[PDB]
């Protein structure tokens, strides 16, 4: 029997800062125990200061990113070159995904950018288009390895102030872009060490009011 789905591995990570957002992903593409590519970009600049990744079955991911990029193009044509806001992009993606409710895009989709107040935004979708705005989200193979660490280090979960002994929580202080990038790199270093599908390279797209910047870092290749 023909199985229309496959698993290309990979792991992605979105983090929303106060006036910025990052969407990172490893650059390894795999099937089973084979490496297809050590550098196949997975996180994409879609225009209008929105970055997107559709991790999972790479064919369905590429298809979805392609359709959304085209949705941005046609939004400009149909609405007098209006900027597609991140919240509007999110709802548009829900409908793209839910459109294939009974033959899904087998992907965990994450977008990142800035909301209409200039604050950092991340949105996270299941394969059939349920979605929500989140501060923090890892997706794909090593998401279970990364999310607990982000609960602990971003949101200061289970952390309390020394001396009070469980009475006063550690306050939720804001993280800088340099601080967030450290968490991303170390999350991917940890995920690479412990998950076989994660490695080769890490590519981070950083969204600010000035635009979309990229950073690339080597990851362990075995």
């Amino acid at each position: 029997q023909f199985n229309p789905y496959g698993d290309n591995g990979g792991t992605i990570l979105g983090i929303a800062g106060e006036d910025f957002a990052v969407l990172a992903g490893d650059t390894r593409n795999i099937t089973d125990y084979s490496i297809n590519s050590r550098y196949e970009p997975k996180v994409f600049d879609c225009g209008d200061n929105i970055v997107m990744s559709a991790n999972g079955f790479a064919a369905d991911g590429d298809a979805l990113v392609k359709r959304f990029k085209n949705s941005v193009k046609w939004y400009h044509f149909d609405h007098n070159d209006k900027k597609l806001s991140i919240n509007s992009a999110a709802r548009n993606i829900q409908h793209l995904l839910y459109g294939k409710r009974f033959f899904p895009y087998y992907v965990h989709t994450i977008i990142a950018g800035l909301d209409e107040d200039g604050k950092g935004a991340v949105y996270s979708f299941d394969p059939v288009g349920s979605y929500e705005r989140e501060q923090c989200r890892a997706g794909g193979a090593a998401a279970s390895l990364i999310m607990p660490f982000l609960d602990n280090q971003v949101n200061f979960k289970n952390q309390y102030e020394p001396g009070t002994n469980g009475k006063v929580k550690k306050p939720l202080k804001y993280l800088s872009v340099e601080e967030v990038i450290k968490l991303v790199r170390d999350s991917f270093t940890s995920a690479t060490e412990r998950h076989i599908q994660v490695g080769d390279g890490l590519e981070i797209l950083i969204v600010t009011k000035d635009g979309v910047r990229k950073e690339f870092y080597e990851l362990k290749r075995d």
Binding site: N152, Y160, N165, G166, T189
Partner: protein, 219 residues
């Protein structure tokens, strides 16, 4: 896993990676897969790790008793037979895939043993999920009657091929060189990947965790 062995001029060179996996997760990055059978015979292990471990230990134990009774070093053919006949009896349910290598009174011998109880006697072999990557290196560069440091390099190169190209394989490269005059157990032979350096310290300060009650008992 990537395990491999070659027959060289003076003896046998065995090789193995060090990655132990549970599903997609790496449980141990530096585990030992080159097992002791007898002083002159070692066994690289792939497949179901528990089956590999306890099958090598049982045959090693029985060979030790055999060798005490006869008073002479055991042979590779007897190690091969005892592994073979047991694995065959269990019809593939003991998932042990071994590369068995050693040096006898009759010279150096290398075997591949499969879970179902078949064995091949060969000048070079590879097993595990990284066998094809490793075998490519042997088909590319193997020749009979190699010198020691050359054979070491070829096996190390074959394990490396597995480490990088196969996701099931990783970590360090272990070798075991066996000849009439010596046994060299090289662990690790090579460290092809450095451990990833962390940029932040995420360890919590004392009193951060919320405790309900405490008890201290001395020993």
């Amino acid at each position: 896993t990537t395990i491999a062995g070659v027959v060289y001029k003076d003896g046998i060179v065995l090789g193995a990676d060090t990655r132990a996996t549970e599903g997609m997760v790496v449980a141990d990055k530096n585990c030992s897969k080159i097992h002791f059978i007898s002083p002159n015979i070692y066994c690289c292990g792939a497949g179901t790790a528990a089956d590999t471990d306890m099958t090598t230990q049982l045959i090693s134990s029985n060979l030790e008793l055999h060798s005490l009774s006869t008073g002479r070093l055991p042979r590779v053919v007897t190690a091969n037979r005892m592994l073979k006949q047991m694995l065959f009896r269990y019809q593939g349910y003991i998932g042990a895939a071994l590369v068995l290598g050693g040096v006898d009174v009759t010279g150096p011998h290398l075997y591949s043993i499969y879970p179902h109880g078949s064995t091949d006697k060969l000048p070079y072999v590879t097993m595990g999920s990284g066998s094809l990557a490793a075998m490519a290196v042997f088909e590319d560069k193997f020749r009979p009657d190699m010198e020691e440091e050359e054979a070491k390099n070829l096996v190390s190169e074959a394990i490396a091929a597995g480490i990088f190209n196969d996701l099931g394989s990783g970590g360090n490269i272990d070798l075991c060189v066996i000849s009439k005059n010596k046994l060299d157990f090289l662990r690790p032979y090579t460290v092809p990947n450095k451990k990833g350096t962390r940029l932040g310290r995420y360890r919590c300060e004392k009193g951060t965790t919320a405790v309900l009650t405490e008890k201290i008992t001395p020993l």
